[PDB]
Design a binder for these strands. Sequence first.
DNA 1: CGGCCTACG
DNA 2: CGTAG
DNA 3: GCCG
Length: 326
Amino acid sequence: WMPAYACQRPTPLTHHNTGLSEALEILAEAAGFEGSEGRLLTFCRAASVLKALPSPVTTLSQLQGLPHFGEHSSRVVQELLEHGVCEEVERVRRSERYQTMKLFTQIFGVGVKTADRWYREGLRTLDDLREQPQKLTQQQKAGLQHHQDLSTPVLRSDVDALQQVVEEAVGQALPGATVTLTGGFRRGKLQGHDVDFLITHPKEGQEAGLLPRVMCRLQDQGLILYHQFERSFCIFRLPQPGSWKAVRVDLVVAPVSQFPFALLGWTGSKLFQRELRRFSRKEKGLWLNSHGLFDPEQKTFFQAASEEDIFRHLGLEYLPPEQRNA
DNA sequence: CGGCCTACG
DNA sequence: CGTAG
DNA sequence: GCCG
Ligand SMILES: [Mn+2]
Ligand SMILES: [Mn+2]
Ligand SMILES: [Mn+2]
Ligand code: NA
């Protein structure tokens, strides 16, 4: 009754197994810090299954037959049901390795591989990094300078103000171009780490060269604290009562022919899209990315005019963005 | 056992 | 290497 | 870590 792929089931933003899913996601995150993408995926998938259930898991028997629940994930749930805590999870939580890798990878410009190298060098704190700026890229310097603001959640009220300033710049750069909110806010989140926008133009080809023109205009308005094509990963100045704060903003351009694929990809969730691409390739023999959907036997691309088209071409029931919170 | 999403900057 | 969902 |  529970399909194996996250793109085969609705997953709402809020659900009935929050504590259980959180614990499994700690173990997933820890596996990622150790470079075990397979273990990360299984724990992420198990967590996602619980988010899709219609009511709370109260007894171990309710895990029977659920996909991605084997001995390990089942034992985590068992311990949480019986004692309210899982010793493995708590050991990860308090571990110096987990805490430091989490802190370092949160920095814009720092990935698992950099964080791990710094950890092995003995570094543990942000001030450790600041007192050695020669070891840092300009991207990492920006991420470290702005880390405090970037650690503060973006609110949906922030988002609407940002969208209007992006629209004004986009309108000067190319009249008729449009701006669509994507990412977690499109899935209904009330908060986020960043804001994602997708830009296109109704006349195919008119979007060529657009993003540099948009960025130059935002920079001239004094709004860009950091940036640097079709993707721009920025830090923006956002107004605040009597001051401002730094906010991560991603700007993406797509031709209108590819817009449904780009919208689908950039709306996420991350696990939803990995699962959708995995389903496409393994179950349907089609190759999906944010530009299109390729049939490698006919050597043809599927034209899509909507996200609904894409779900139909993959043989999946349509899920609105609010149900893609895998 | 092999596989685990698939891009761009 | 970083970034994205 | 789990599916197939
Ligand atoms: Mn986002
Ligand atoms: Mn983003
Ligand atoms: Mn993301
Ligand atoms: Na990072």
